[PDB]
Amino acid sequence: ATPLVLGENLCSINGWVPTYRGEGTTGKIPDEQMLTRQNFVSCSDKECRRFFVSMGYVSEQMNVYSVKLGDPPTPDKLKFEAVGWSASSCHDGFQWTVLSVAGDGFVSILYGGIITDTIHPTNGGPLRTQASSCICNDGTCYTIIADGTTYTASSHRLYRLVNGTSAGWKALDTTGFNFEFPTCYYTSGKVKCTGTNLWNDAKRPFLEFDQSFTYTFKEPCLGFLGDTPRGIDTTNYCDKTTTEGEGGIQGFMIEGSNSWIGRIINPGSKKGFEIYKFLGTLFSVQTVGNRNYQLLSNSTIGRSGLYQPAYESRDCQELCFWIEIAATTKAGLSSNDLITFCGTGGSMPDVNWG
Amino acid sequence: ATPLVLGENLCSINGWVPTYRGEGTTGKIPDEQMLTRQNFVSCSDKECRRFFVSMGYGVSEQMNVYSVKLGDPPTPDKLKFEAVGWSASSCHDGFQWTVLSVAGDGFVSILYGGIITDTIHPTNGGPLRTQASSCICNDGTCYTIIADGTTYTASSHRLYRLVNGTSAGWKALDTTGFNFEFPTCYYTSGKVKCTGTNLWNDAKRPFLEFDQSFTYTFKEPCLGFLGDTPRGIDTTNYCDKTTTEGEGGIQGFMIEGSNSWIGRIINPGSKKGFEIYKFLGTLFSVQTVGNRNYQLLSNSTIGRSGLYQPAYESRDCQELCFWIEIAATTKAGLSSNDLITFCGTGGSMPDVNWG
Amino acid sequence: ATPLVLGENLCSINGWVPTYRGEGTTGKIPDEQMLTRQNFVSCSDKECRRFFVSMGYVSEQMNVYSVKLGDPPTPDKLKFEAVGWSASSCHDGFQWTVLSVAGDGFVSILYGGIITDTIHPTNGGPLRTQASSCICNDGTCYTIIADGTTYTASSHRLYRLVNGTSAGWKALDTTGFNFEFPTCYYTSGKVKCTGTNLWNDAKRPFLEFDQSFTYTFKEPCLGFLGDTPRGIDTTNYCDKTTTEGEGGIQGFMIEGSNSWIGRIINPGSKKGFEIYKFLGTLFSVQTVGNRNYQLLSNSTIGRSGLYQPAYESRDCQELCFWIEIAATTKAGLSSNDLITFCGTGGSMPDVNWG
Amino acid sequence: ATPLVLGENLCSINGWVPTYRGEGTTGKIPDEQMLTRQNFVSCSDKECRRFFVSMGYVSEQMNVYSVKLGDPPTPDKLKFEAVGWSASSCHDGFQWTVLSVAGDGFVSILYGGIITDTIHPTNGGPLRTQASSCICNDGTCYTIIADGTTYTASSHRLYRLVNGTSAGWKALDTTGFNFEFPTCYYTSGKVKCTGTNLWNDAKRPFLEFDQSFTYTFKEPCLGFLGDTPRGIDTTNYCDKTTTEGEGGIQGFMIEGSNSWIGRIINPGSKKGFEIYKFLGTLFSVQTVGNRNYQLLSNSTIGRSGLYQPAYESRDCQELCFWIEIAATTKAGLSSNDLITFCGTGGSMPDVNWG
Ligand SMILES: *[C@@H]1O[C@H](CO[C@@H]2O[C@@H](C)[C@@H](O)[C@@H](O)[C@@H]2O)[C@@H](O[C@@H]2O[C@H](CO)[C@@H](O[C@@H]3O[C@H](CO)[C@@H](O)[C@H](O[C@H]4O[C@H](CO)[C@@H](O)[C@H](O)[C@@H]4O)[C@@H]3O)[C@H](O)[C@H]2NC(C)=O)[C@H](O)[C@H]1NC(C)=O
Ligand SMILES: *[C@@H]1O[C@H](CO)[C@@H](O[C@@H]2O[C@H](CO)[C@@H](O[C@@H]3O[C@H](CO)[C@@H](O)[C@H](O)[C@@H]3O)[C@H](O)[C@H]2NC(C)=O)[C@H](O)[C@H]1NC(C)=O
Ligand SMILES: *[C@@H]1O[C@H](CO)[C@@H](O[C@@H]2O[C@H](CO)[C@@H](O[C@@H]3O[C@H](CO)[C@@H](O)[C@H](O)[C@@H]3O)[C@H](O)[C@H]2NC(C)=O)[C@H](O)[C@H]1NC(C)=O
Ligand SMILES: *[C@@H]1O[C@H](CO)[C@@H](O[C@@H]2O[C@H](CO)[C@@H](O)[C@H](O)[C@H]2NC(C)=O)[C@H](O)[C@H]1NC(C)=O
Ligand SMILES: *[C@@H]1O[C@H](CO)[C@@H](O[C@@H]2O[C@H](CO)[C@@H](O)[C@H](O)[C@H]2NC(C)=O)[C@H](O)[C@H]1NC(C)=O
Ligand SMILES: *[C@@H]1O[C@H](CO)[C@@H](O[C@@H]2O[C@H](CO)[C@@H](O)[C@H](O)[C@H]2NC(C)=O)[C@H](O)[C@H]1NC(C)=O
Ligand SMILES: [Ca+2]
Ligand SMILES: [Ca+2]
Ligand SMILES: [Ca+2]
Ligand SMILES: [Ca+2]
Structure with missing residues (x-):
């Protein structure tokens, strides 16, 4: 057992490839699955996990659970992580650290499953x-x-x-x-x-x-x-765009020799997701923009975030991201699911994923 | 490949936070779970396990001792069969699990690994x-x-x-x-x-x-x-038995330390809520004081409660935890138990309900 | 890995303890379980396993399966072992060796799941x-x-x-x-x-x-x-009693310091199972007959056999036995299941296990 | 720890024996099990695994999964591999490499489960x-x-x-x-x-x-x-047989001291699988053809392919094959499953394996 250490150098990224399309590819999520909330992905030295918060199938009765990325959130496959409604986690090579907001709004750090x-x-x-x-x-x-x-x-x-x-x-x-x-x-x-x-x-x-x-x-x-x-x-400028600057939703940019900005396509109907390569730093007016992939056109989009698979000693560090999507259960309840893309140096075609 | 060895010195404790909270604490237990009873927690040098005796499914598979990794539901997929019995204690020495199980007319079989020893x-x-x-x-x-x-x-x-x-x-x-x-x-x-x-x-x-x-x-x-x-x-404080209403009783714990604790059920009538009271000094003087009563649970119906020490630490003090068995109900309506667990924090906590 | 290796000396045995009791020890087998026959138990260096032959829920359709001792033979818990209607297995520290009679009546030998x-x-x-x-x-x-x-x-x-x-x-x-x-x-x-x-x-x-x-x-x-x-x-004599010497069923004896012989008590209806201690060898006529244990009563019994849990370091080799019991399913189908007992140095109360 | 390296010399093969035979060969399939397609077998340094593509219990709703050969494709034994409808895989001694086709039809390579x-x-x-x-x-x-x-x-x-x-x-x-x-x-x-x-x-x-x-x-x-x-x-001739050469289905030949050609017995009703031994090279008109084994008789046959187990210190490299067959689940949906045959050195009697 050894400390997890990530790669010093990113893989070059020219496009994105799905590594998971959640349980709503059929249009509807099975009702035996937990209503999932605040979804994100984190990876250990052996696997990638889906973490989320749930009650059943801000409240005193929300828990943090995880499943293995790709397993569906059914009772069988759940791991209790913590009590709380907001969570962050990461693995260091020895154990999961899970940070959770519960009670009157304090955070508890659990390591393995012990308060630390x-x-x-x-x-x-x-x-x-x-x-x-x-x-x-x-x-x-x-x-x-x-x-x-x-x-x-x-x-x-x-x-x-x-x-x-x-x-x-x-x-x-x-x-x-x-x-x-x-x-x-x-x-x-x-x-x-x-x-x-x-x-x-x-x-x-x-x-x-x-x-x-x-x-x-x-x-x-x-x-x-x-x-x-x-x-x-x-137009390009170096300070804040204050117009419509109130509100917001979790999302990411990647700064690299190639930079990227992922966003929701239609801000009004929260529909579609695009991600757009630029040739150079996100922090120069002079940088240009090279390719824009419309990854989703028809789904409604919530939060999105980065993750790094880490079980590696490879020559190049891989980069991925998740998107939380509005879904509907078979019975007809509102829920979320989760889709994941990973980078590739190969230039990709134009494919809509949903 | 080494004997389990616990810290000689306990971590300081001034509060408690849950580490596990079964589904039955906040709603109905799913029907796919094995019905459990006589739950308790024991830890090895790699993990904490939830030991229990089964009652079956929604009328099925009873009479045996099982364990799961604490954090995992007792679905068929997660069950390790352990012994035959209605009553068990377990422990781990660094090499194997020792399981004491009462069976038959009340003899105790001892299993080391899965081997009767x-x-x-x-x-x-x-x-x-x-x-x-x-x-x-x-x-x-x-x-x-x-x-x-x-x-x-x-x-x-x-x-x-x-x-x-x-x-x-x-x-x-x-x-x-x-x-x-x-x-x-x-x-x-x-x-x-x-x-x-x-x-x-x-x-x-x-x-x-x-x-x-x-x-x-x-x-x-x-x-x-x-x-x-x-x-x-x-x-009042005094140094012998309280014989009044001393017939009957339920498994529960006290913690003796620089700081002491008594955990109990809040309403002994309807067995509702759980509190744990910190005392400044030993449980065995009449002068020791009484500092902070934490009302950890309110909503739910309490039964047995027990102690356990995790030891897959590389920690400079020995951590202490407890488990509380809860009366609960399955989605179908069958009554059953599960489990909430708490471990100590060095810092004082706010008044919050955990279940 | 390393080779499996047993104890040269048997643990003393004065009594017997159940390590596993099937569903049909305790009444009626659920219908989702396979219909086992030719049950037996063989151990590896990490677990004991229940091997059997089944066909559904001499034939070409017969297969050999196994489960971990303790797990029920639900389809989920099954491991395919070989094609056949007759089987012996054992583990050498490296791999399961499995002998299976199949086809017209030749035995195939599988090591891992490869024919050797x-x-x-x-x-x-x-x-x-x-x-x-x-x-x-x-x-x-x-x-x-x-x-x-x-x-x-x-x-x-x-x-x-x-x-x-x-x-x-x-x-x-x-x-x-x-x-x-x-x-x-x-x-x-x-x-x-x-x-x-x-x-x-x-x-x-x-x-x-x-x-x-x-x-x-x-x-x-x-x-x-x-x-x-x-x-x-x-009375004791060193020759074959030929009297109803025709017919037969699988069973065992144990030779040691104390020595044992178990048998169906009633050969009429095949009800009950007993096991009887002797103070010395089975091959002297002069040898006594101590304690008789009536482990089973109301149950109609059949094949029985031996197994040595082989995962020790120990001062003594444990010795166990399985008994195959007639049983019934919830839909009334005739079938079998399995109970196991292991030895213990001490003497046991008179307990009836079914 | 070390690169998988196969045996330079094949085992002598004069017969075939089944090492896995799916439940749908000998009856109907439990509906708990997933609806597998594009089944095939690949082996590592430790085990053989059954890979397949499924939907649930050029289609965009499909994913690549795998189970250990011998386990059933129930949720608990399942393992997600990749998004896609077409897959190939192999183990190098370190990690699974999985090739999957998704989208409009690019391929992704996954190593571990990391996109590479x-x-x-x-x-x-x-x-x-x-x-x-x-x-x-x-x-x-x-x-x-x-x-x-x-x-x-x-x-x-x-x-x-x-x-x-x-x-x-x-x-x-x-x-x-x-x-x-x-x-x-x-x-x-x-x-x-x-x-x-x-x-x-x-x-x-x-x-x-x-x-x-x-x-x-x-x-x-x-x-x-x-x-x-x-x-x-x-007759034997050394070029294409063009008549009825449109269409076709995946299958194998083996080139050796003894060559073989496996094929579906009835081209119209795709029933029966046979394999034919040839005394010498597939690539001389002169070579003769001796023993013809009628391996499957009852089953409707589809795809068939080769695999080589490598968990071994044999003295000689083993050869196996899998056959995908049409099947029906208990509720009567069309599905597939798998029979695998491995080579043995001896000649074999004419048995019907399914
Ligand atoms: C301990 O118990 C308390 C209170 O118990 C409540 O009353 C008891 C007498 C009994 O009837 C209990 O069954 C009952 O829960 C629990 O505190 C309650 O927690 C719930 C859920 O977090 C709250 O319900 C919410 O109420 C909001 C307005 O008051 C409302 O906006 C919420 O609606 C939202 O969620 C629902 C789904 O539940 C959804 O349908 C809606 O559309 C919307 O999203 C929701 O109804 C109560 O307010 C709380 N009651 C009080 C007085 O505090 C507590 O959770 C429990 N503790 C534990 C740990 O189990
Ligand atoms: C955080 O946790 C990690 C993991 O437990 C701790 O790393 C461990 O640190 C100890 C102290 O050096 C190591 O124990 C020693 O290992 C050496 C060589 O293996 C041995 O010679 C000693 O007898 C002793 O056993 C341990 O190896 C190391 N863990 C590993 C496997 O890398 C770390 O100390 C913790 N950090 C803090 C500040 O608590
Ligand atoms: C049956 O299979 C087993 C396991 O594959 C074989 O045992 C193996 O024996 C070989 C040679 O006897 C061992 O190789 C040697 O290992 C030692 C270290 O123990 C090393 O110093 C040497 O350089 C050499 O590599 C091998 O370790 C051993 N396998 C194990 C895990 O014990 C056995 O030979 C097979 N039976 C026959 C006769 O084919
Ligand atoms: C209990 O079991 C352990 C593990 O089998 C024994 O520890 C071994 O003891 C032997 C004999 O001295 C040593 O050769 C090994 O190095 C020990 N193993 C380890 C990992 O420590 C222990 O001796 C047994 N205890 C008793 C009294 O039987
Ligand atoms: C492919 O993967 C293997 C396994 O990681 C690599 O082998 C490693 O090589 C490095 C450099 O010499 C060693 O530090 C490791 O110990 C090796 N691993 C093992 C377990 O043998 C191999 O180098 C890789 N090849 C390339 C070019 O990526
Ligand atoms: C192939 O088909 C035949 C015909 O249904 C099967 O043969 C039957 O097998 C059962 C049980 O083994 C017997 O009770 C019947 O009498 C047999 N009928 C005939 C006409 O032979 C055979 O088992 C099938 N093979 C496999 C492995 O599925
Ligand atoms: Ca904003
Ligand atoms: Ca009392
Ligand atoms: Ca006889
Ligand atoms: Ca053709």
């Missing part, structure tokens, strides 16, 4: 996890937690975790903006994170940091707006 | 009774307590030491004047410490501590915060 | 396995196969196997008698086996041999008749 | 995997992919895979024929494949190649026609 730490609100609660995979590398896990009673006065903290106990935190300067649900990936000695501004920005705030918690917030300079809601696409 | 028989009439809880293993040897006698008014109890599934000798315990059923135990500071249940003449709970040389002393809590159910009104 | 040898009838056919766990020790496996068109003129061969392959064999002088379904065990450098005489004996014959094939048949000098059917019990 | 590469058509698609085990030896894996919109103008490529990454491919000259669904085996420094010609040949095209991609297409010189459909068997 709790964290309590300080700016008025409730605490909010990043609702996405956290990042473990070489024995340490990193995560981001939000406090504050309004998005207009939110506070954000960067946590480092060792075997599930807090090894410290750092206040992030988020003056002038809001930074919810950061979804992250590791590369070249940095964790890089895309968050959601529910207050004043139709673009997404960006964050990178290293293990010394030296950090930088960045604003994407591209008029292709990532948030939903949002207005008309703008 | 010993058998224990009643002197004083039977039927024999396990502690219905985890046994304690440390550094190769495992300890457990077994009850004999036909009435709670004439109960005998024995301390058993076990190596690799075989009996490495035993001591008769002096329980003259009280009853000591279903002890739940923990290890710290060189002693095994157990909390028993007196179904005869005490509404407080009897206490035991002992080392590997079978040097024991039984203690009696000097606290008027009455641990058993049933029970009467809370009393 | 075939054995064909010379003396008439069809061939017949020992219907019971064969024995493996130190990388090498031993079994006994029978040929002959009738039990009068039956031939018996002793096979040595390594990794699934015939490593030579030996003919056994069974002039005089018949040696069907030997059920065996190992100690003291010898493999001791108990056969069923369907010809001229209502006692059970007895084999022992070493790894270098030196063997001797012995006759129990004992008037406690083990085979079924049988006559009234007799 | 894609492959794209340039001749119009969809792409088609060999629908059978691909071949790994000494760390590198080989597989063959088909492209093109008619079989009249089909196109084929031979890929070299290393840890799930493409290390190159070579065009195969299939001028004047079609080469679908090759099913292959390894010996004597060569990979040998039997294909299916849907265009202009009732015999089966054959292909051998070495690790440096030197290859030779051969036509079998035997008038015992391998494909279905086909016409009247003819």
